[model samples]
Target: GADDVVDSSKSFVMENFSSYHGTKPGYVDSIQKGIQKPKSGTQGNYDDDWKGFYSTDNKYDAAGYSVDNENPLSGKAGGVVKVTYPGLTKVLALKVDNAETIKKELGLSLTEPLMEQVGTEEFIKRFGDGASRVVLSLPFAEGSSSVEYINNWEQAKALSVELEINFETRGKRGQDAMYEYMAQACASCINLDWDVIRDKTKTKIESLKEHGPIKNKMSESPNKTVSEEKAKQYLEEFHQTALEHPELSELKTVTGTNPVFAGANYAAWAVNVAQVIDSETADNLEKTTAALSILPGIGSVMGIADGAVHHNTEEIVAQSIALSSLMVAQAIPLVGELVDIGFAAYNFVESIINLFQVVHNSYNRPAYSPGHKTQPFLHDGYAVSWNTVEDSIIRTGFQGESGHDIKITAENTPLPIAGVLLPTIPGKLDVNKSKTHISVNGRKIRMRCRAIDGDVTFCRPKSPVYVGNGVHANLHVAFHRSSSEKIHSNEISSDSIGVLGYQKTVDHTKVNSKLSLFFEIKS
Candidate 1:
């Protein structure tokens, strides 16, 4: 009778997760038993623990706002934007090691009396349990780390992980080549071949083979899987794309920007390059299904089997943590602070800032005609949305689908062998599990759960281009929900999408590097 008092916390997590999963199409059927917390220590599987999430068996409802003015939406006090990530709401038992430092940057209290960041839980309560969206990192740590923050942190708010993460080499430089090459790839692929996707995948794979060696050995999937090995001819090819560059752009006079470069809305609100870029864009989803099979961690679209590919929890934690410390090993200048600020802190700041500012000068023009005769000048605002997933990454929630609460992201290694396997950075010394070893950066971010699964939601704003002092005073920025046609054609039942607009750089939030700007918000 004493223990039966009932954990409101448990009930809260269950309510948010189950309620959301019901409408989302992918694994709803499978998690029907719902995300029941695994009885203490009964199991240790990755998918079972929901890849480090369910493992926490906790609830977090922190609150801290970036602004208390500009209440533009339905209505509110601080104008703190809402983000659609219930994961930020649910997972509470994470280690917040040093969130204060970053919190200080957000104009928040950097000491005790810690407040909550504007995320799902707080937003829900803020609006009487309706819907919520937005995540400002000042409140409390979402059990995620800076490296994982690199994984979780997405400033633009557009739903989806960086396409760079899916490549052999990731982070910025890889994207430079990938986005640069793919622009032309999208432009001409349509005029050239229908089977182009299939062909290039194979070509990429082949070239990847010549360069890195993809070992298609059996891994830990539901099917008769394969193993990972440097035993080249094993999962090695996924790493070669870093050095390999795609053939890389143009814009034409249409209502919007070039379907190739800007992808219809490159500068406007929400841009869906689906049929705009490649003819079989949506059709390629089928390809996403199969091509993703080559991927190390992924789940199928049909039915509700959340994760068809079952990577061991230990395996992923090993990959996540093992790879994270290596982050301290590897490491930016878009705006150029040029200093070793705290364990690569300065580099970390700019690396993270790279997405917020447009280094690409050309994307400043809005692609779509600013409707109603609006004076389209260069503006910077976050173009935000959910994640549009692929092979290298696992899309836990369905894209464009509303009900899903916790959007999960499961990152993978090029090869399944659990160690410092990233070839992009040749010199990562696998560090010890011992914490408190602050380097040029600060502390070794302690992550109890799978940090890769830790995604984010934030409201970004103006960075000053043609006018005033960088702040959009009392301005209202609302997230326009993405429609069916608006999502990435390659994402199958994804829990993410591409939309929203914002601060710095010409790369239009640098989101997906596909959609940028035709600045239309008449400021």
Candidate 2:
């Protein structure tokens, strides 16, 4: 449908497409001739601009000037740079002397000049001598500057074009071009959103104001007076006091756990945007509302939507319920997103706690034992004490026999049971002493006990009992022994009864004092 008009317009176009591309000498020469030097200020270097820097160290000190010259690579150029102040303009001022000094003071490497005026290829080659110095200069806001982080001269040119068109009626072509330039300018500062910056800054300023004047203990002398000679001494003492009292100073006292301040400056960022939106009486309210409808979700793209919402606006107690209602009415997804973020945070904290528990268990446990590993019990047998009330060695000799029996004495009215000898569960004992633990009479004993026994003992006797009462109990004499080879019969005296390798008082308090945890990834 548009082809007819285009074709008709082509006659008046005058071969405009000829400038698109070509390799021929004649056509290329003709296009180049019509190019008209790419415009002077548009493509030239913009060297000579100077900017002032304010810092605690310099305090509004004047930094050197820098020139923005053209780049040979893209054939782009910038206008002359100049320091603009009340009524002074300095051009072609490359402060090389101070550049080297500033570089040292700032601990900066000067591979390229940070604040030097741009020059033509010939001018730079002749004057600069490839030594582009480093100095402070104006920061780039919407364009490049003579600073390291804020260098984007090409964008600056585009910005200049934008300024011209925005202030003037640049028509559709100029406005579109200006927009393209602005977009490019923003590409460099990816994480630097102007709205977020302003919001954060406003919040900071409000917070700072709330904090009020900082306490400077060292501002005055200890004696509250000073003289020239005493100036140095007092200064040293003051600085020493500052250094010593860092904990008591403003910075020393501030931890990260500070309360949030409620002020218009702190909340003005959201206030600013909302105000802007409100003030812009919509020509197309429906379209504007539809676009804004997606903003709450979009705010969460970086997981900062809730943070922005929570801190961005001022929370007033009077309107708390009403504002909350408005928020729910506006977007339910926003609330859901906040919930998800909270859950994720909780999961993260829980994961760390779990890791700490695992680490603690690993350092203090036996890896092989499935249950809590007992530290080798030293109990010759259970219930081996004399029962004066009952009379006989009560409940002894299970299975009609206890491997060996003590011969009765006419004078011995009732022999107190020293220990109950434990017979091996059939086929339980193994010859491998490392694996098989021997318990005289049926109690856990250590390697030292086995070493002392030389073999398993089968008999029992009391300490005060006559030597003749001792008996030898070993494999096969009484309760069944393991099929595997085991120790021969060994004599058991009363002292050894109910005692492993050594005899010690029972410590019931230490039963499971060092209980440990084991992590099992269950199927």
Candidate 3:
């Protein structure tokens, strides 16, 4: 039974998922382990596949060539060698032979003494056993379409001759940067006319098909594969270069910390709830109540919801007109210059709006309802001191499809009389209706409220009111209280109690009103 269990499991897996087992580890996972254990017939390590590669001088000695030719220290003074090849750009090698002599000839000065430029033991550690050959390779800049032309030693076959010495001291941009060669002198100090060489090479490449390989005695220039030690030096140099160039650095910016809106100082991005209050009666309310009544406006705009604007209407219209005028001006060449100036003004304002949008969209952190115990509910980027929700600055009236409305109700309840009441004739009392208004977008709208059964009702406007999208609005309300009188006397003036009992009474009455704004996304 145990054997049957194992056999059944194995049979199921093998039959249903055999394809996965064939490449169990996957190509990337396998290749990352090392160079796939060199192909069958390689006598040496993995690098042996490179042509003309040797680990020892025995091969050069057997070939009967002077070993000095393989060394960078060989007495090859200032010279230029150009090589041509199939399927590659021209390769020009320059040697500076003597650094001090060239510096003197050019009347150039080095800020640091040559003695200070001495290589340390650590430098040797990075450079490796002072190899006779060094390949300083700088990768092509990012996004550059140029192909690398000095990839392998086989390309050297094109340069059949070791040109006689002739070294130019003047420098030009891009000349010393990309040029590659085994220079016995200070590589940093060497410079050449790369543009001239490039032009000449281009001409040579044009007739390259007709020119056969030229015979030169320097053909057997013993080439060796880069040993592991040499490869480490290239890696060190690459790392150092990356450190020196900011473009090559991989640091990333934190989106949350970016002051995109703050840097722009955009006032539109801020929610000013105090602006919603009626400025005429700003000093009438208690300081505490007024403060409590102020809160940041909900993020919304006119032309998107039913709202009225109370300020900046002219400026807004002017901006729109200006942008449109500039766009139309593009039709004429003479006015096109004016169009450029107009767009500059347009962009200045438009950029503020865009900056506000970026903060609202992605970079702004979510606003949670205190403690962060629940999911975030508000999108207002600014923090408010109190929770007094006034009419939305962006939109005033709620849409019909919104299933909700910005309804406000005001009422005055009866109060009992306490003091004595004076004799007076009873007459109809004068009652005034409360007044309310809302600044939708930039338009001001006064709302009328009627008293019905002692309760005032504030209704939506008869016509459709459109508020600009992402705008601000102001709302204000005032409730009038009905007056009442009563009289109260503890003993009823004992002597007059007989004539009028409980006739003494005090007058008591109070007036109060309130307005509330509410709506949903659809509303």
Per-model clash counts, in order, read 76, 29, 42
TM-score of 1: 0.16
Q: What C-alpha root-mean-square deviation, in Å, does candidate 3 show against the real structure? A: 36.7
Off by over 4 Å in 1: 1-123, 132-176, 181-523
Model 3 lDDT per residue over 368-467, tens place: 2321222112211211111233222111122111011122111222211111111111121211212434444546565433333222232333222332
lDDT of candidate 1 over 1-523, digit per residue (tens): 2112212232222223211111111222333333332355422123221111111111111011111123211111111111223433322222232444334433334442222232324433542134333222112233222111111122113222111112122233212322332224234021212123223333432342233212221121112112212212221222122222231100011112222222111111101111121223223332322222232211110000221212112222122221111111111111111221232222222221122111121132122231112212122322211112111122122222111111111122111101111101001111122221111112122211111111312222212211122211111111222322332323222222212222235665443222211111110
List all candidate RMSDs to the true structure. 27.4, 33.1, 36.7
- Order of models, best lDDT first: 2, 3, 1
* Cα-based TM-score, every candidate: 0.16, 0.15, 0.14
Best by lDDT: 2
Model 2 residue 297 distance off true place after TM-score fit, in angstroms: 12
Q: After superposition, how far is residue 1 of candidate 2 from its true place, in Å?
A: 70
Which of the numbered candidates is closest to the native, going by highest TM-score?
1
Q: What is the lDDT for 78 in model 3? A: 29
Scored against the true structure, residue 201 in model 2 reaches a CA lDDT of 30
Q: Report lDDT (CA) for all predictions.
A: 0.21, 0.24, 0.23
